[PDB]
Design a binder for this molecule. Structure first.
Ligand SMILES: CCCn1c(=O)ccc2c(-c3cnc(-c4cccnc4)s3)n[nH]c21
Ligand SMILES: [Cl-]
Ligand SMILES: [Mg+2]
Ligand SMILES: [Mg+2]
Ligand SMILES: [Mg+2]
Ligand SMILES: [Mg+2]
Length: 193
């Protein structure tokens, strides 16, 4: 009850003053979206679980981030009455500032999916398949109502920071791929010691 209401208010707050939360709604804040998600994958690597992160720029400037960590948990979270992944993602600034966001969790030999719009879940978390892997996939589309100047990512910007993050976080393989033009796909992959 109260907990879920807290959530909605939090989404409203973020969408009303997005620059207070991500610095700006310029091109810089657009790329900050990617940094927020990649930092979560880095934390799961530092915790000992993940070692591979992939960032894909998809057609129409969707971003897909994939890690091979444990998978965000799906167990019903005691204070919300809702799956843990739903709590974590409805408290995410990226989700609030995305027109659409999808999660796929590989965990417990199961693939779970949920989708969101401006942070609001579109359906309850569902089992959609099976798996013998663990990890988490998040795909999002930046909200052009927030990012009013541009929602087009800059590969070089992405590449320079990804390269830095792999250099700083030795052992994690981090891959960037641009699939926006299916006729000319570019990938860079970084892996320091
Ligand atoms: C591309 C997805 C990036 N990403 C996020 O944006 C947010 C959370 C996480 C996690 C986990 C958090 N907590 C875990 C957890 C904790 C305890 C037990 N099992 C998993 S996994 N992994 N990746 C993430
Ligand atoms: Cl779980
Ligand atoms: Mg954060
Ligand atoms: Mg974080
Ligand atoms: Mg953290
Ligand atoms: Mg079903």
């Amino acid at each position: 009850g109260a907990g879920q209401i807290q959530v909605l208010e939090g989404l409203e707050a973020v969408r009303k003053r997005p620059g207070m939360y991500i610095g700006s709604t310029s091109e810089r804040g657009l790329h900050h979206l990617v940094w927020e998600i990649v930092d979560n994958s880095i934390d799961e690597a530092l915790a000992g679980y993940a070692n591979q992160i992939e960032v894909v720029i998809e057609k129409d400037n969707w971003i897909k981030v994939t890690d091979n960590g444990r998978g965000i948990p799906v167990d019903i979270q005691e204070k919300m009455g809702r799956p843990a992944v739903e709590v974590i993602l409805t408290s995410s600034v990226v989700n609030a500032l995305s027109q659409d966001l999808e999660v796929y969790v590989h965990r417990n030999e199961t693939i779970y999916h949920q989708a969101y719009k401006k942070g609001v879940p579109q359906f309850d978390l569902k089992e959609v398949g099976t798996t013998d892997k663990t990890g988490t996939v998040i795909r999002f589309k930046a909200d052009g109502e927030i990012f009013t100047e541009t929602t087009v990512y800059n590969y070089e910007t992405l590449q320079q920071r990804i390269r830095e993050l792999a250099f700083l976080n030795k052992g994690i393989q981090i891959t960037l791929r641009d699939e926006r033009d299916e006729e000319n796909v570019r990938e860079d992959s970084y892996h320091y010691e």
